[PDB]
Structures are given as structure tokens and as C-alpha cells.
């Protein structure tokens, strides 16, 4: 663009290419996500248009801010606030070793942003460390809404092919075609565990089957009484019954009993039982914060 | 009055009434254009099921009522604007990650298409979310569409 000077290419766009840039008029540093419109990758503008539609309606300190959208050349440019790094890179920077106060701050900010999305009837559906941006002020922002969607209108189904595998909840792994805000809450629990240990995925499954096994191996396999509809899900198949007795103490060593309790409320297999973002923010984990 | 075919006919009758300059427009014309796009996406492998359902037609009508000018000057222009609204509907409400431009493009000037998308989004982004968030609003739109016949 004429108003913006490109500084560096810094970005694994989720669907396009991200650049660090300077607004020539105000001297402010921003991030530009550029999208070719004379495509050869036919469907990209579609995701970008959806992200623009949603981000226009999602203005909160903990959601990445879309400032403007430009259309020039054969290019769509989204102008975003600039953030120095994502959580994935941040883990590499600190040897995966966060102070427990920063673990708490990061989870709190994630939940505030996520709670805001859910209260506005938007599911993120791709919550993972690379989609979490962090400032040098220590501010965390949910980003990359290209898989997100508004929810509420009567629909026959949603896609079960949502959420990066390692962050996908068991109901969706079992092919549930209807899910609610609970989908993101599971992913938040996964991120929480990485924050509270050494910044490595809790459940790095190789495929859907391995994914479910890793989850149940740690948390226990749900019984019919805990999750009556489980066996009725479209891609259900019988899993071993792993005991619900396995301690998480060493899985999340940065956490006290209070933190472990919140973690378990996020990582409930039955989506109906999963804590909401609003409820999580009222959890005693955040009381002295 | 709940079936897709009936609601689509309601939308077609609405567009004919809205676009008073289009003397030779048939109420089935918009239905043909919409169904054609949906069939093409299915056959070509872009989606496994059709997008055109009662709820999505209501969503589309909500866009059309605010975006489509009574002053549209040709059937071609109506098709281009309608298909822009349809493309935004697939993009926003569809179950696939993305959809190709080709089936929605009937104009030579691609830049006009993209400018139209952005203009519609600037106008409608709030209502696009509100129709999902507010069941009463969705009901109002649905009732309005029904009463278009």
C-alpha cells in the first residue's frame, strides 16, 4: 500500500502472508495480512472475508484487533495491531519455563478473550499456541479466526473437521456434528497444560484413534453414567476403560490443587460438563489476581 | 412454507417486486441461479452436502433485503449482486473452510466483485452475527420471508 511501508515478512499467515509494517502517516507499527485476489488457490478470499466479518464485531483487548481492510492491486490487505510473537515462539524463547504468575496471566487473558467471543456467539475452533499472540507488555490476544464461525441459527450440522487434532475434544473426535462453546473450552484446557508444564502439547496424537487413546489414558475413559450420549455419537467405537485415578500432579507441576481443579473442569470429556469461559474466570485459581 | 423450495420461491418473488426495473425477470430466475451454484459446488467436490437449506435462505434474504437496490438496472446486475450476497453467505455460514470464486462470478470486472463484498460486509456484519445470536430476530426474518409470497 501507499500508506504503509513494509518492514519484514514475519508471518505464517493462516491463509495469507503477514508483514510487519509502518503507517507512513502516523509512524505506528502494524501487521499487514495480504491476500491475493487473482488467486490460483481458489478458496482463500472466502476465509479472509469471514475473518473480516467476525473481527469487525469482536473488539476486545484480548482478541487481535483488525484496524482496517484495504483493497488495491489484486490484493486484499487486513491491517492488524502488531504483536511481537506467538505463544509457540514464546515457549522456545523461555525454554518452555513460565513463572506460575505468567501461566495465570496468560490463561486469564485467554479466557477473557474467549469469553468475549462466546458471549458474542462466535466459536473460534482453532485454539492453539500459534494462534495466541503475545505483546512485550505481556498482553495476550486470541488470533487467526479463519476457522471461526457465528453460531445460533438452526443448522443441521457443523463440521467435525475443526480444531487442529491435538487440541480437538473427544466428542468432536467421535464425530459430533453439533457442539457449542464447549469446543474451545477443551482447547483452552490443552493450552493450560502446556503453560503449566514445559510448553509441549499434552495430547500429541498421530491420528484420531491415537488422539482419543492419549486423552482417555490420562483422564480416564468416560462411563455411560458420566456421558450417556457418548456411545451414540456417529464415529463412536469402543475404547479400553482407562482408570480415572491417574494423578495430574506431574503433568502440570506449575499448578497447585486449585489450578489442577480448573484444568480438570476444562478437560471434561462430556462437553455438557465442561466449564464455560465465564465460570472459569470466577474460579478460585484467579481470586488473588 | 418451511421447505427450501417454498422459501426460495418467496425470495424470487421478493426480488421481482424489489427490482421493479427488470420487466422480464422471472421469480424462478434467482432460484435457478442459486440452485445452479449449489449443484456445481457439490458435483465439483467443494462440498459434500448442499448449502441451500431453510435457515441459509433466510440468512441470504436478510442480506438481499438490505443490499439489493430497487434501482438495479439489468437482470445481469441483479445476478451479480445476488451472487455476491450468496458468496458471503457460503463464506460466513457454510461448513467448508473455503469456497471458490468461479461459480459466483458473472462479471468481467473482478475488482467490482471484491469491492461489493467489502461494501456488503461493512453494511451487514452486525446483522450477520445478530441473526445467529438473536433467535427472535431470526424468527422475524423468517416470518418476513414467508410473507413475501
Tab-separated table of C-alpha atoms in Angstrom:
chain	number	residue	atom	x	y	z
A	1	UNK	CA	0.000	0.000	0.000
A	2	UNK	CA	0.871	3.700	-0.319
A	3	UNK	CA	0.004	4.490	3.341
A	4	UNK	CA	2.076	1.544	4.644
A	5	UNK	CA	5.792	0.765	4.369
A	6	UNK	CA	6.658	-2.967	4.593
A	7	UNK	CA	9.414	-3.735	7.115
A	8	UNK	CA	9.785	-7.527	7.123
A	9	UNK	CA	7.858	-10.680	6.259
A	10	UNK	CA	7.213	-12.125	9.754
A	11	UNK	CA	4.161	-14.226	9.397
A	12	UNK	CA	2.839	-17.664	8.779
A	13	UNK	CA	-0.474	-16.236	7.684
A	14	UNK	CA	-3.086	-18.864	8.390
A	15	UNK	CA	-4.355	-18.350	4.808
A	16	UNK	CA	-2.255	-15.471	3.501
A	17	UNK	CA	1.074	-13.748	4.147
A	18	UNK	CA	1.846	-11.493	7.157
A	19	UNK	CA	4.197	-8.473	7.105
A	20	UNK	CA	5.425	-6.047	9.745
A	21	UNK	CA	4.689	-2.550	8.524
A	22	UNK	CA	4.793	1.118	9.380
A	23	UNK	CA	1.915	3.544	8.821
A	24	UNK	CA	3.693	6.399	6.993
A	25	UNK	CA	1.155	8.962	8.232
A	26	UNK	CA	1.158	8.078	11.971
A	27	UNK	CA	4.512	6.174	12.196
A	28	UNK	CA	2.705	3.355	14.008
A	29	UNK	CA	3.912	-0.232	13.635
A	30	UNK	CA	1.174	-2.611	12.407
A	31	UNK	CA	0.816	-6.124	10.977
A	32	UNK	CA	-0.490	-6.498	7.405
A	33	UNK	CA	-2.039	-9.821	6.261
A	34	UNK	CA	-2.111	-9.733	2.431
A	35	UNK	CA	-4.372	-11.940	0.321
A	36	UNK	CA	-4.037	-12.365	-3.422
A	37	UNK	CA	-7.402	-11.960	-5.156
A	38	UNK	CA	-6.324	-13.091	-8.626
A	39	UNK	CA	-5.809	-16.467	-6.996
A	40	UNK	CA	-4.630	-19.842	-8.127
A	41	UNK	CA	-5.612	-21.114	-4.624
A	42	UNK	CA	-9.300	-20.594	-5.339
A	43	UNK	CA	-10.893	-20.521	-1.870
A	44	UNK	CA	-8.600	-18.224	0.164
A	45	UNK	CA	-10.554	-14.911	-0.159
A	46	UNK	CA	-13.599	-16.751	1.293
A	47	UNK	CA	-11.859	-17.425	4.627
A	48	UNK	CA	-10.448	-13.878	4.718
A	49	UNK	CA	-13.924	-12.382	4.185
A	50	UNK	CA	-15.277	-14.498	7.016
A	51	UNK	CA	-12.439	-13.378	9.305
A	52	UNK	CA	-13.115	-9.716	8.426
A	53	UNK	CA	-16.866	-10.133	9.111
A	54	UNK	CA	-16.198	-11.645	12.531
A	55	UNK	CA	-13.296	-9.425	13.677
A	56	UNK	CA	-15.317	-6.265	12.883
A	57	UNK	CA	-17.708	-7.453	15.614
A	58	UNK	CA	-15.098	-8.637	18.082
A	59	UNK	CA	-13.414	-5.656	19.701
A	60	UNK	CA	-11.793	-6.681	22.981
A	61	UNK	CA	-8.300	-6.216	24.476
A	62	UNK	CA	-7.663	-9.979	24.300
A	63	UNK	CA	-8.724	-10.524	20.670
A	64	UNK	CA	-6.362	-9.431	17.897
A	65	UNK	CA	-7.555	-6.071	16.623
A	66	UNK	CA	-8.443	-5.605	12.962
A	67	UNK	CA	-7.862	-1.873	12.310
A	68	UNK	CA	-8.671	-1.636	8.594
A	69	UNK	CA	-9.072	-3.512	5.322
A	70	UNK	CA	-7.556	-2.315	2.106
A	71	UNK	CA	-8.313	-3.343	-1.425
A	72	UNK	CA	-5.731	-2.323	-4.052
A	73	UNK	CA	-3.881	-4.108	-6.839
A	74	UNK	CA	-5.388	-7.596	-6.951
A	75	UNK	CA	-4.869	-7.754	-3.228
A	76	UNK	CA	-6.891	-7.707	-0.041
A	77	UNK	CA	-4.873	-6.379	2.919
A	78	UNK	CA	-6.046	-6.734	6.501
A	79	UNK	CA	-4.388	-4.221	8.843
A	80	UNK	CA	-3.966	-5.657	12.360
A	81	UNK	CA	-2.344	-4.493	15.605
A	82	UNK	CA	1.251	-5.724	15.720
A	83	UNK	CA	2.292	-8.353	18.246
A	84	UNK	CA	5.884	-9.323	18.838
A	85	UNK	CA	5.378	-13.101	18.978
A	86	UNK	CA	3.062	-16.050	19.389
A	87	UNK	CA	2.884	-18.427	22.354
A	88	UNK	CA	4.632	-21.176	20.428
A	89	UNK	CA	7.669	-18.952	19.811
A	90	UNK	CA	7.435	-17.593	23.366
A	91	UNK	CA	7.841	-21.172	24.670
A	92	UNK	CA	11.045	-21.506	22.600
A	93	UNK	CA	12.280	-18.149	23.975
A	94	UNK	CA	11.925	-19.157	27.646
A	95	UNK	CA	12.927	-22.801	27.433
A	96	UNK	CA	9.253	-23.734	27.972
A	97	UNK	CA	9.571	-22.478	31.532
A	98	UNK	CA	6.968	-19.882	32.551
A	99	UNK	CA	6.660	-18.379	36.011
A	100	UNK	CA	3.360	-19.516	37.593
A	101	UNK	CA	2.179	-15.869	37.683
A	102	UNK	CA	2.664	-15.647	33.900
A	103	UNK	CA	0.880	-19.012	33.442
A	104	UNK	CA	-2.032	-17.478	35.373
A	105	UNK	CA	-1.908	-14.172	33.468
A	106	UNK	CA	-1.849	-15.932	30.117
A	107	UNK	CA	-4.777	-18.221	30.984
A	108	UNK	CA	-6.781	-15.323	32.415
A	109	UNK	CA	-6.313	-13.242	29.279
A	110	UNK	CA	-7.127	-16.218	27.033
A	111	UNK	CA	-10.342	-16.821	28.940
A	112	UNK	CA	-11.346	-13.162	28.860
A	113	UNK	CA	-10.928	-13.064	25.075
A	114	UNK	CA	-12.615	-16.412	24.600
A	115	UNK	CA	-15.424	-15.478	26.993
A	116	UNK	CA	-15.971	-12.337	24.951
A	117	UNK	CA	-16.148	-14.377	21.688
A	118	UNK	CA	-18.620	-16.860	23.170
A	119	UNK	CA	-20.801	-14.066	24.626
A	120	UNK	CA	-20.954	-12.606	21.083
A	121	UNK	CA	-21.989	-16.006	19.659
A	122	UNK	CA	-18.699	-16.834	17.928
A	123	UNK	CA	-16.739	-20.094	18.191
A	124	UNK	CA	-13.008	-19.824	17.493
A	125	UNK	CA	-12.424	-23.530	16.653
A	126	UNK	CA	-8.641	-23.330	16.210
A	127	UNK	CA	-7.339	-22.540	19.682
A	128	UNK	CA	-3.635	-23.494	19.884
A	129	UNK	CA	-0.386	-21.728	20.943
A	130	UNK	CA	0.483	-20.438	17.441
A	131	UNK	CA	-2.902	-18.643	17.330
A	132	UNK	CA	-2.209	-16.858	20.590
A	133	UNK	CA	-0.261	-13.604	20.196
A	134	UNK	CA	1.800	-12.046	22.983
A	135	UNK	CA	2.949	-8.435	23.439
A	136	UNK	CA	6.075	-7.097	25.033
A	137	UNK	CA	3.603	-5.588	27.512
A	138	UNK	CA	2.648	-9.178	28.409
A	139	UNK	CA	-0.765	-8.861	26.765
A	140	UNK	CA	-2.190	-11.997	25.120
A	141	UNK	CA	-4.546	-11.916	22.144
A	142	UNK	CA	-6.586	-14.644	20.506
A	143	UNK	CA	-5.896	-14.560	16.762
A	144	UNK	CA	-6.459	-16.233	13.411
A	145	UNK	CA	-10.194	-16.507	13.140
A	146	UNK	CA	-10.193	-18.166	9.714
A	147	UNK	CA	-11.823	-21.324	11.128
A	148	UNK	CA	-14.196	-19.378	13.409
A	149	UNK	CA	-17.945	-19.105	12.949
A	150	UNK	CA	-21.041	-17.414	14.309
A	151	UNK	CA	-23.428	-19.889	15.974
A	152	UNK	CA	-27.109	-19.730	16.936
A	153	UNK	CA	-29.163	-20.180	13.740
A	154	UNK	CA	-30.877	-23.614	13.317
A	155	UNK	CA	-28.323	-25.729	11.407
A	156	UNK	CA	-28.464	-29.444	10.503
A	157	UNK	CA	-24.791	-29.800	11.457
A	158	UNK	CA	-21.393	-28.173	11.760
A	159	UNK	CA	-18.141	-29.646	10.520
A	160	UNK	CA	-16.457	-32.194	12.815
A	161	UNK	CA	-13.246	-31.491	10.905
A	162	UNK	CA	-12.443	-28.486	13.033
A	163	UNK	CA	-9.674	-27.842	15.527
A	164	UNK	CA	-6.092	-28.936	14.962
A	165	UNK	CA	-6.050	-32.631	16.068
A	166	UNK	CA	-4.019	-32.248	19.292
A	167	UNK	CA	-6.487	-29.593	20.555
A	168	UNK	CA	-9.714	-31.278	19.442
A	169	UNK	CA	-12.154	-32.568	22.106
A	170	UNK	CA	-13.357	-36.192	22.361
A	171	UNK	CA	-16.976	-35.516	21.327
A	172	UNK	CA	-15.685	-33.986	18.060
A	173	UNK	CA	-13.147	-36.824	17.697
A	174	UNK	CA	-16.199	-39.118	17.934
A	175	UNK	CA	-17.781	-37.155	15.061
A	176	UNK	CA	-20.286	-34.998	16.930
A	177	UNK	CA	-21.874	-32.711	14.334
A	178	UNK	CA	-23.323	-30.364	16.934
A	179	UNK	CA	-21.150	-28.706	19.526
A	180	UNK	CA	-21.295	-25.391	21.379
A	181	UNK	CA	-18.833	-23.017	23.032
A	182	UNK	CA	-17.573	-26.121	24.854
A	183	UNK	CA	-15.367	-26.950	21.848
A	184	UNK	CA	-12.980	-24.062	22.585
A	185	UNK	CA	-13.005	-24.774	26.318
A	186	UNK	CA	-11.357	-28.158	25.758
A	187	UNK	CA	-8.688	-26.486	23.620
A	188	UNK	CA	-8.140	-23.897	26.400
A	189	UNK	CA	-7.551	-26.787	28.840
A	190	UNK	CA	-4.969	-28.264	26.468
A	191	UNK	CA	-3.142	-24.891	26.261
A	192	UNK	CA	-3.360	-24.509	30.047
A	193	UNK	CA	-1.473	-27.816	30.481
A	194	UNK	CA	1.319	-26.648	28.145
A	195	UNK	CA	1.611	-23.355	30.034
A	196	UNK	CA	1.803	-25.219	33.373
A	197	UNK	CA	4.465	-27.748	32.371
A	198	UNK	CA	7.124	-27.225	29.684
A	199	UNK	CA	5.211	-25.822	26.747
A	200	UNK	CA	4.720	-29.177	24.937
A	201	UNK	CA	1.348	-30.491	23.697
A	202	UNK	CA	-0.404	-32.639	26.288
A	203	UNK	CA	-2.023	-34.950	23.712
A	204	UNK	CA	0.128	-35.161	20.526
A	205	UNK	CA	-1.860	-37.901	18.762
A	206	UNK	CA	-0.811	-39.341	15.399
A	207	UNK	CA	-4.384	-39.728	14.133
A	208	UNK	CA	-7.925	-39.612	15.572
A	209	UNK	CA	-7.626	-43.034	17.247
A	210	UNK	CA	-4.307	-42.227	18.905
A	211	UNK	CA	-5.722	-38.864	19.937
A	212	UNK	CA	-8.664	-40.434	21.838
A	213	UNK	CA	-6.360	-43.017	23.438
A	214	UNK	CA	-3.966	-40.382	24.767
A	215	UNK	CA	-6.867	-38.411	26.194
A	216	UNK	CA	-8.536	-41.374	27.914
A	217	UNK	CA	-5.218	-42.863	29.032
A	218	UNK	CA	-4.603	-39.710	31.097
A	219	UNK	CA	-8.067	-38.651	32.213
A	220	UNK	CA	-9.845	-41.975	32.348
A	221	UNK	CA	-12.396	-43.322	29.903
A	222	UNK	CA	-15.872	-41.819	30.435
A	223	UNK	CA	-18.593	-44.236	31.585
A	224	UNK	CA	-22.183	-44.278	30.274
A	225	UNK	CA	-23.236	-42.587	33.516
A	226	UNK	CA	-20.809	-39.692	33.050
A	227	UNK	CA	-21.551	-39.349	29.325
A	228	UNK	CA	-24.767	-41.160	28.291
A	229	UNK	CA	-24.761	-40.000	24.665
A	230	UNK	CA	-21.106	-40.991	24.050
A	231	UNK	CA	-21.852	-44.416	22.525
A	232	UNK	CA	-24.445	-42.855	20.213
A	233	UNK	CA	-22.031	-40.461	18.502
A	234	UNK	CA	-21.610	-41.008	14.716
A	235	UNK	CA	-17.947	-42.150	14.822
A	236	UNK	CA	-18.056	-43.825	18.237
A	237	UNK	CA	-16.146	-47.039	18.711
A	238	UNK	CA	-15.268	-48.948	21.914
A	239	UNK	CA	-12.136	-47.835	23.751
A	240	UNK	CA	-10.418	-49.543	26.674
A	241	UNK	CA	-11.595	-48.320	30.073
A	242	UNK	CA	-8.557	-46.484	31.440
A	243	UNK	CA	-8.834	-45.612	35.162
A	244	UNK	CA	-9.843	-42.138	36.354
A	245	UNK	CA	-7.216	-42.486	39.088
A	246	UNK	CA	-4.115	-41.183	37.293
A	247	UNK	CA	-2.597	-38.179	39.081
A	248	UNK	CA	-2.051	-34.968	37.055
A	249	UNK	CA	0.369	-33.599	39.653
A	250	UNK	CA	3.429	-34.318	37.487
A	251	UNK	CA	1.666	-33.440	34.219
A	252	UNK	CA	1.264	-29.828	35.350
A	253	UNK	CA	3.963	-29.191	38.014
A	254	UNK	CA	3.482	-25.355	37.989
A	255	UNK	CA	-0.053	-25.829	39.359
A	256	UNK	CA	-1.405	-26.176	42.850
A	257	UNK	CA	-4.590	-28.187	43.683
A	258	UNK	CA	-6.599	-25.067	42.729
A	259	UNK	CA	-5.029	-24.894	39.263
A	260	UNK	CA	-5.349	-28.665	38.758
A	261	UNK	CA	-9.059	-28.376	39.614
A	262	UNK	CA	-9.589	-25.684	36.935
A	263	UNK	CA	-7.621	-27.785	34.434
A	264	UNK	CA	-9.915	-30.760	35.060
A	265	UNK	CA	-13.031	-28.590	34.612
A	266	UNK	CA	-11.789	-27.533	31.175
A	267	UNK	CA	-10.753	-31.099	30.275
A	268	UNK	CA	-14.098	-32.786	30.810
A	269	UNK	CA	-14.732	-35.301	28.034
A	270	UNK	CA	-18.533	-34.821	28.079
A	271	UNK	CA	-18.955	-31.338	26.527
A	272	UNK	CA	-22.016	-30.595	28.690
A	273	UNK	CA	-19.790	-30.935	31.781
A	274	UNK	CA	-17.054	-28.550	30.568
A	275	UNK	CA	-16.703	-25.272	32.413
A	276	UNK	CA	-17.674	-22.116	30.464
A	277	UNK	CA	-15.198	-19.275	29.985
A	278	UNK	CA	-17.396	-17.032	32.222
A	279	UNK	CA	-17.389	-19.686	35.013
A	280	UNK	CA	-13.660	-20.296	34.619
A	281	UNK	CA	-12.941	-16.585	35.220
A	282	UNK	CA	-14.754	-16.874	38.553
A	283	UNK	CA	-12.718	-19.975	39.572
A	284	UNK	CA	-10.617	-19.501	42.783
A	285	UNK	CA	-7.461	-20.001	40.610
A	286	UNK	CA	-7.928	-16.313	39.656
A	287	UNK	CA	-9.119	-14.940	43.013
A	288	UNK	CA	-5.840	-13.299	44.136
A	289	UNK	CA	-5.111	-11.846	40.722
B	1	UNK	CA	-43.743	-22.706	4.000
B	2	UNK	CA	-40.789	-24.334	5.742
B	3	UNK	CA	-39.387	-26.215	2.758
B	4	UNK	CA	-36.380	-24.834	0.932
B	5	UNK	CA	-38.238	-24.752	-2.403
B	6	UNK	CA	-41.013	-22.573	-0.956
B	7	UNK	CA	-38.653	-20.121	0.755
B	8	UNK	CA	-36.580	-19.877	-2.437
B	9	UNK	CA	-39.746	-19.023	-4.373
B	10	UNK	CA	-40.521	-16.388	-1.704
B	11	UNK	CA	-37.048	-14.911	-2.228
B	12	UNK	CA	-37.569	-14.918	-6.013
B	13	UNK	CA	-40.920	-13.153	-5.696
B	14	UNK	CA	-39.315	-10.617	-3.355
B	15	UNK	CA	-36.524	-9.794	-5.842
B	16	UNK	CA	-39.047	-9.311	-8.681
B	17	UNK	CA	-41.027	-6.902	-6.514
B	18	UNK	CA	-37.882	-5.110	-5.250
B	19	UNK	CA	-36.277	-4.793	-8.708
B	20	UNK	CA	-39.141	-3.019	-10.444
B	21	UNK	CA	-36.963	-2.006	-13.466
B	22	UNK	CA	-36.463	-5.612	-14.542
B	23	UNK	CA	-39.510	-6.150	-16.688
B	24	UNK	CA	-38.574	-9.593	-17.960
B	25	UNK	CA	-37.212	-11.087	-14.750
B	26	UNK	CA	-38.869	-14.349	-13.703
B	27	UNK	CA	-39.276	-15.218	-9.979
B	28	UNK	CA	-37.727	-18.600	-10.918
B	29	UNK	CA	-34.598	-16.879	-12.304
B	30	UNK	CA	-32.986	-16.222	-8.882
B	31	UNK	CA	-33.945	-19.793	-7.876
B	32	UNK	CA	-32.188	-21.208	-10.979
B	33	UNK	CA	-29.061	-19.092	-10.297
B	34	UNK	CA	-28.837	-20.169	-6.633
B	35	UNK	CA	-29.547	-23.855	-7.223
B	36	UNK	CA	-27.025	-23.874	-10.102
B	37	UNK	CA	-24.186	-22.630	-7.882
B	38	UNK	CA	-25.061	-25.157	-5.131
B	39	UNK	CA	-25.253	-28.073	-7.569
B	40	UNK	CA	-21.942	-27.081	-9.169
B	41	UNK	CA	-20.102	-26.899	-5.811
B	42	UNK	CA	-21.479	-30.327	-4.922
B	43	UNK	CA	-20.653	-32.009	-8.248
B	44	UNK	CA	-17.197	-30.449	-8.391
B	45	UNK	CA	-16.286	-31.706	-4.906
B	46	UNK	CA	-16.162	-28.414	-2.993
B	47	UNK	CA	-18.825	-29.642	-0.552
B	48	UNK	CA	-20.404	-32.996	0.386
B	49	UNK	CA	-23.939	-31.647	1.013
B	50	UNK	CA	-25.929	-28.673	-0.306
B	51	UNK	CA	-25.682	-25.270	1.348
B	52	UNK	CA	-29.206	-24.275	0.378
B	53	UNK	CA	-31.387	-25.025	3.435
B	54	UNK	CA	-34.313	-23.110	5.012
B	55	UNK	CA	-32.051	-21.308	7.522
B	56	UNK	CA	-29.448	-20.342	4.926
B	57	UNK	CA	-32.132	-18.988	2.596
B	58	UNK	CA	-33.429	-16.816	5.464
B	59	UNK	CA	-29.839	-15.631	6.053
B	60	UNK	CA	-29.476	-14.847	2.360
B	61	UNK	CA	-32.775	-12.985	2.275
B	62	UNK	CA	-31.658	-10.857	5.241
B	63	UNK	CA	-28.663	-9.769	3.160
B	64	UNK	CA	-30.712	-9.196	-0.019
B	65	UNK	CA	-33.354	-7.022	1.699
B	66	UNK	CA	-30.737	-4.505	2.813
B	67	UNK	CA	-28.209	-4.758	-0.030
B	68	UNK	CA	-30.164	-5.112	-3.290
B	69	UNK	CA	-31.226	-1.721	-4.599
B	70	UNK	CA	-34.686	-1.196	-6.103
B	71	UNK	CA	-32.696	0.577	-8.845
B	72	UNK	CA	-30.741	-2.415	-10.193
B	73	UNK	CA	-30.664	-1.703	-13.927
B	74	UNK	CA	-30.396	-5.137	-15.564
B	75	UNK	CA	-31.008	-8.811	-14.814
B	76	UNK	CA	-27.240	-9.273	-15.120
B	77	UNK	CA	-26.601	-6.726	-12.371
B	78	UNK	CA	-29.141	-8.453	-10.130
B	79	UNK	CA	-27.437	-11.769	-10.676
B	80	UNK	CA	-24.009	-10.265	-9.842
B	81	UNK	CA	-25.254	-8.646	-6.607
B	82	UNK	CA	-27.321	-11.691	-5.576
B	83	UNK	CA	-24.309	-13.946	-6.139
B	84	UNK	CA	-22.086	-11.636	-4.144
B	85	UNK	CA	-24.597	-11.989	-1.266
B	86	UNK	CA	-24.620	-15.771	-1.858
B	87	UNK	CA	-20.824	-15.953	-1.775
B	88	UNK	CA	-20.768	-14.074	1.541
B	89	UNK	CA	-23.442	-16.491	2.846
B	90	UNK	CA	-21.354	-19.576	1.958
B	91	UNK	CA	-18.274	-17.871	3.405
B	92	UNK	CA	-19.960	-16.947	6.676
B	93	UNK	CA	-22.420	-19.820	7.251
B	94	UNK	CA	-21.076	-22.737	5.175
B	95	UNK	CA	-19.460	-25.854	6.651
B	96	UNK	CA	-16.413	-25.879	4.340
B	97	UNK	CA	-13.242	-23.884	5.118
B	98	UNK	CA	-13.469	-22.027	1.840
B	99	UNK	CA	-15.324	-21.776	-1.459
B	100	UNK	CA	-14.032	-20.900	-4.951
B	101	UNK	CA	-14.895	-17.648	-6.694
B	102	UNK	CA	-15.673	-19.088	-10.142
B	103	UNK	CA	-19.385	-20.135	-9.677
B	104	UNK	CA	-20.251	-16.753	-8.190
B	105	UNK	CA	-18.566	-14.577	-10.788
B	106	UNK	CA	-20.671	-13.382	-13.718
B	107	UNK	CA	-18.933	-10.004	-14.244
B	108	UNK	CA	-15.830	-9.238	-16.275
B	109	UNK	CA	-14.516	-6.767	-13.698
B	110	UNK	CA	-13.309	-8.827	-10.726
B	111	UNK	CA	-12.405	-5.685	-8.755
B	112	UNK	CA	-16.085	-4.669	-8.706
B	113	UNK	CA	-16.928	-8.045	-7.199
B	114	UNK	CA	-14.379	-7.639	-4.355
B	115	UNK	CA	-15.415	-4.012	-3.730
B	116	UNK	CA	-19.041	-5.196	-3.499
B	117	UNK	CA	-18.081	-7.927	-0.979
B	118	UNK	CA	-16.390	-5.371	1.250
B	119	UNK	CA	-19.256	-2.899	0.970
B	120	UNK	CA	-21.808	-5.580	1.906
B	121	UNK	CA	-19.648	-6.677	4.851
B	122	UNK	CA	-19.346	-3.060	6.031
B	123	UNK	CA	-23.109	-2.714	5.849
B	124	UNK	CA	-24.188	-6.108	7.186
B	125	UNK	CA	-21.521	-7.537	9.525
B	126	UNK	CA	-23.530	-6.717	12.666
B	127	UNK	CA	-26.793	-8.202	11.336
B	128	UNK	CA	-24.961	-11.301	10.077
B	129	UNK	CA	-23.908	-12.018	13.644
B	130	UNK	CA	-27.187	-10.797	15.254
B	131	UNK	CA	-29.351	-13.185	13.177
B	132	UNK	CA	-27.306	-16.002	14.728
B	133	UNK	CA	-27.212	-14.514	18.248
B	134	UNK	CA	-30.879	-13.451	18.474
B	135	UNK	CA	-33.478	-16.193	17.832
B	136	UNK	CA	-36.249	-13.544	17.850
B	137	UNK	CA	-34.537	-11.662	15.023
B	138	UNK	CA	-34.078	-14.888	13.018
B	139	UNK	CA	-37.805	-15.594	13.576
B	140	UNK	CA	-38.707	-12.073	12.397
B	141	UNK	CA	-36.654	-12.505	9.198
B	142	UNK	CA	-38.121	-15.964	8.582
B	143	UNK	CA	-41.671	-14.626	9.049
B	144	UNK	CA	-40.866	-11.711	6.727
B	145	UNK	CA	-39.568	-14.072	4.031
B	146	UNK	CA	-42.718	-16.232	4.298
B	147	UNK	CA	-44.863	-13.124	3.889
B	148	UNK	CA	-43.016	-12.234	0.651
B	149	UNK	CA	-45.265	-14.625	-1.251
